[PDB]
Amino acid sequence: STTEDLAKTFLEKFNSEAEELSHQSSLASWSYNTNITDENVQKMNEAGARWSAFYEEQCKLAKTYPLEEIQNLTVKRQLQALQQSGSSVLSADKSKRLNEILNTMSTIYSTGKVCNPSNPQECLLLEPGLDAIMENSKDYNQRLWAWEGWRSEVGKQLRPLYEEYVVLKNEMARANNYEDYGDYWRGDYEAEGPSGYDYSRDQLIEDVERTFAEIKPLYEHLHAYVRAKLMDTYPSHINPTGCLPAHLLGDMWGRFWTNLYSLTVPFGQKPNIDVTDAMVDQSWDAKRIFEEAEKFFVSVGLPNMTQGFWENSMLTEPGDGRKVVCHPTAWDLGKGDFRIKMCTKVTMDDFLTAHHEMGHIQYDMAYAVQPYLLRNGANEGFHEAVGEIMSLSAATPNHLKAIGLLPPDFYEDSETEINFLLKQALTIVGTLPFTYMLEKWRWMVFKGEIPKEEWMKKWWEMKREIVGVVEPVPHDETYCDPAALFHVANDYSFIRYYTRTIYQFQFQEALCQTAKHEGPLHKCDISNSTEAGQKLLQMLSLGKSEPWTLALERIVGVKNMDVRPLLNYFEPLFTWLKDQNKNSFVGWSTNWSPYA
Amino acid sequence: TNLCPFDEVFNATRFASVYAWNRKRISNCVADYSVLYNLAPFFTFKCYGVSPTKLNDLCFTNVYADSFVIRGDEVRQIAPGQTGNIADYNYKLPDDFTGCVIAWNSNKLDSKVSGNYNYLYRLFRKSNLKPFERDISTEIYQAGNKPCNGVAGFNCYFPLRSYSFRPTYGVGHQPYRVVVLSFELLHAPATVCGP
Ligand SMILES: *[C@@H]1O[C@H](CO)[C@@H](O)[C@H](O)[C@H]1NC(C)=O
Ligand SMILES: [Br-]
Ligand SMILES: [Br-]
Ligand SMILES: [Br-]
Ligand SMILES: [Br-]
Ligand SMILES: [Br-]
Ligand SMILES: [Br-]
Ligand SMILES: [Zn+2]
């Protein structure tokens, strides 16, 4: 008996029904995604309905095997995965209240209109109207009414729904042994693996806070340099020693500072490296782009793309009347079926994302040797980090010279390097305080440390302090500005954008050290380093069969997050920013307001 | 010049399930081993104890041809000293096996868009097969200690599973047709020569 041995037989049977049932769901999902059709929606819905049906039956079967009786960690980790359902424990009357609220929040966000006070005929959605204003407008007042209007119209409607959402989500989490819903979300990082590879859910708060304190000095200098440049655009509204107003940061929420590049570029006389003209010059097509990506992974010792990858993928928008929504995705349908769905164009962007999506594919191929339930990234942040580091090596001048998109005589200016690092910091470094503060607010709200009379009082107190961002208009407790973001309104965890940012530079630095790359980390190119590939494969092949701490240690040597690789990546920019800010206030005072 | 019926074995319309593998006795004929071009892009020809080059020069008393269909990554199990579901429970070759194993991709013939569930294999068995044993039993597999009653009951399993074969599968999951040529030599007559 030894129920493990009984559970191995159950898992032996499960791995055949599950692996191919999940395949039918992918095929039906692929049919809709590559051919949008009323009929194809039904097949995808019904195939997924079958797959979700089976899976929840098997969970019951797997729950008749005491997890405290199994010695194989692999068998344990497989049985472990079949559990952990969610809102099923919630009562029937409370269950439909929750999914009522969720669909209400999702809809009023996606359909919410905001009307310009100067023109009542001008009422714009978020996409494409309000997004266009926040990403491109340089007028202070035009940005203000879109920012306030979005948080007033859709934000206030979400406020009472979110108060009920927090209460309901907490009760389901408490009925799952979790402290709160934030504690439930941190379960995606819990590891109970061997020896000192274990990772508690409470550790995530400490390790995120510890890492962010080491990122704060770099962010402050980026914050000060951006602030000093924004003075030349909004002189009447920018305090040189105060927080940046929220509605001037390049999007609706300040999540990314990417769109401040034009106003904040170090050397505007130097254009960014763009090999798009070269790619059209050499008459590249979509097939050539992925062939070059395949060569890049072959150069580091990784396998080629499968024959079915070329035959079955969608590497180009269909010209035969099939309607698809062009969104880059890399598919792992199972049973040896790997595909990429991209409307590839001949641009440097799609050249880079092709390496990113094929980076997803290489991860999927590597852990196919694992059982079905363990075929995933080590945690939720591993996959996107793996894809991102492929774009880093691909975009380097070192790689582009070897590929033939740059002249072998190419001269890269130090000014162009700083221009590139600054643009990276706006997206990468700018989002870190935004991501950390947002999830910290939600964590404390679920933890009950922020009373509902203080939701919008804390939110801007944390936004001023942690992010250095101040609201342009005072907001009472009728607002819900966190809910005015997609991820908060659509019941999605947000700390992944913080962890995978740290993971990717930990990955890249370790791979570049293995490749013995001399020089700044941001210039490293892991191409033609088979040694880097094996160290990468040591983690890719693991999948989710080991704790993410152990999988992290296999590639980078340490079993936890570390931001020094990130700071090492931005070190040339850090010294440049410090010189530029030696006559500017570095930091911010949380007392000043634009409405003071 | 009596030609041995190799067109029956290799170019058959349908092959047998590996658990119910098919053996075709061959005797008193002329064996022309040179007709096997590739009949597949991915194709395998492994011999043990005998040399396929100059194979149509020797003589044997009887030549048994075993045929079935397995997945691409189970082809390595059709070989001496191999372990795994196909070797352990479906078709086992001896350690001192003398003969050749011929495998080739059959995705065009055996894969169907709606899935081809006709090919089966044994997933559970109390013990490994002896070499060249054939088990077509359909008795319920008792994993636990409560007797399995003939059907409904916990920790019970039907011993046979279905190979689902869809054309978009990876090569390792695609159907491969296997022909195992066992060469038998009790010297004396050696009625199968094939110059
Ligand atoms: C099977 O058919 C093909 C073409 O029809 C032929 O070339 C080949 O020799 C045949 N195989 C056998 C074993 O006769
Ligand atoms: Br609009
Ligand atoms: Br796309
Ligand atoms: Br917290
Ligand atoms: Br906000
Ligand atoms: Br380095
Ligand atoms: Br040939
Ligand atoms: Zn991606």
Residue numbers in the entry:
A (entry chain A): 19 to 614
B (entry chain B): 333 to 527
List sentences quoted exactly from the publication behind this structure.
Receptor binding is a prerequisite for virus infection and transmission. eqACE2 shares 86.78% amino acid identity with hACE2 and 87.35% in the peptidase domain (19-615). In this study, we find that eqACE2 broadly binds to the RBDs of SARS-CoV, SARS-CoV-2 prototype (PT), pangolin-origin GX/P2V/2017 and GD/1/2019, bat-origin RaTG13 CoVs as well as SARS-CoV-2 VOCs. We determine the crystal structures of eqACE2 in complex with RaTG13-RBD, SARS-CoV-2 PT-RBD and Omicron BA.1-RBD.
The structures of the eqACE2/RaTG13-RBD, eqACE2/SARS-COV-2 PT-RBD and eqACE2/Omicron BA.1-RBD complexes were determined with a resolution of 2.60 Å, 2.56 Å and 2.86 Å, respectively. The molecular interaction of eqACE2/Omicron BA.1-RBD is significantly fewer than hACE2/Omicron BA. RBD (244 vs. 287 vdw contacts and 9 vs. 15 polar interactions). Y449 and R498 of Omicron BA.1-RBD form an H-bond network with Q42 and E38 of eqACE2. In contrast to eqACE2/SARS-COV-2 PT-RBD, S494 is not involved in the interaction. Interactions between Q325 of eqACE2 and F374 of Omicron BA.1-RBD can be observed, which locates away from the common binding interface between SARS-CoV-2 RBDs and ACE2 orthologs. Structure alignment showed that F374 of Omicron BA.1-RBD interacts with Q325 of eqACE2 and stretches the α2 helix of Omicron BA.1-RBD (Y365-N370). Besides, the N417 of Omicron BA.1-RBD no longer participates in the binding with eqACE2, which is consistent with the molecular interaction between hACE2 and Omicron BA.1-RBD. Previous study found that 9 of the 15 substitutions carried by the Omicron BA.1-RBD are involved in the hACE2 binding, but only seven of them participate in the eqACE2 binding, namely K417N, S477N, Q493R, G496S, Q498R, N501Y and Y505H. On the other hand, K417N, S477N and Q498R also displayed similar binding affinities with eqACE2, while Q493R, G496S, N501Y and Y505H showed extensively decreased binding (from ~6.2- to ~20.7-fold).
